[PDB]
Each structure stands twice: as structure tokens, then as C-alpha cells.
Symmetry: C2
Subunit: 81 residues, 2 copies
Amino acid sequence: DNNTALKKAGLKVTLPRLKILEVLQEPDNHHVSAEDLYKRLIDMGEEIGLATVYRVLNQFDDAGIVTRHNFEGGKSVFELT
Amino acid sequence: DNNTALKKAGLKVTLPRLKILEVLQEPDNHHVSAEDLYKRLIDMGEEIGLATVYRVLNQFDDAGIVTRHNFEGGKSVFELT
Ligand SMILES: [Cl-]
Ligand SMILES: [Cl-]
Ligand SMILES: [Cl-]
Ligand SMILES: [Cl-]
Ligand SMILES: [Cl-]
Ligand SMILES: [Cl-]
Ligand SMILES: [Cl-]
Ligand SMILES: [Cl-]
Ligand SMILES: [Cl-]
Ligand SMILES: [Cl-]
Ligand SMILES: [Cl-]
Ligand SMILES: [Cl-]
């Protein structure tokens, strides 16, 4: 229940937050960059922009919903905590 | 005093942390991306890697030392809070 997950993390339920959570819950996207998560959203037929993806992920990090990893070469990925 | 800011923020004082705070305090770098901050450090003769810059900035975000902004196109800029 991602509605409950968002409430439990102190965030208003919105479509981008729900759809971003959904992608993070796909096996192939267990770890995902903001750019790849955006591409998956495009593939799904969503119209959620890349800045929104970044904003949501960074809010999720603050809320303790996701973990950020920073790799060599400035490449970054997110996963659910 | 940058040492105090770091200590009160709960972070060990290290040379990269101090150098990163110093770039953020330069008028021209009031707002800067990790990449641009890294470029400036290179210009200063520093040997701080890009992944370290990202890691330090994200720690600074969590400590409430910097504010993060996400612009159109996925551009991710920092400034001191
Ligand atoms: Cl898999
Ligand atoms: Cl697959
Ligand atoms: Cl696989
Ligand atoms: Cl998973
Ligand atoms: Cl894992
Ligand atoms: Cl990391
Ligand atoms: Cl690197
Ligand atoms: Cl893990
Ligand atoms: Cl100048
Ligand atoms: Cl100038
Ligand atoms: Cl300034
Ligand atoms: Cl590095």
C-alpha cells in the first residue's frame, strides 16, 4: 500500500509520488538513476518531467524512503530503504 | 568559522569538507552544481574526486548546511542555507 507508505513518511499522496514508488518497486529498477527512472516513466505512458523526478527522489531521501548512492564518475542511483 | 559549522552540524572536520565549504562561500559559486564545484576545485589545484564532491554535498544537505535546487532539464544546484 503506497498510499499508506507516503502518509507514514509524512508526504501528501500525489500521482508522481505513487508512480515513482511503483518504479522503485520493479525488480529491474531496484537501483535506479533519476534519468533511468524518468525514462521508465516515459515508457509507461506517464507525463512526469525530469525535474519532478529529481524533486520527488530528493524528498524521498529526506523522508527516509530511499537511499542515495554516489559512484565513480558522478553517477548516482536510488533504492528504497 | 567553518570548523564550528561542521562540528555543530555533527560532521568530522576534513580537508575536502573545508575546501567544499570555501568554494560555496565564493561570490561566483553562490549556487553551484557538483560538477561545477569540482571544476573550481580542480582550478584551485585540489585533488578532490568528483564522487567525493557529490558525497560531501549530499551529506551537507542532510546536515542542513546546504539547500538543493532542481531545475528544468535535471540540473541540480546547491547553495549554503
Ligand atoms: Cl532482476
Ligand atoms: Cl528484465
Ligand atoms: Cl538482472
Ligand atoms: Cl526491489
Ligand atoms: Cl541490493
Ligand atoms: Cl554512497
Ligand atoms: Cl570520481
Ligand atoms: Cl541494499
Ligand atoms: Cl568573477
Ligand atoms: Cl563575476
Ligand atoms: Cl554567497
Ligand atoms: Cl572520488
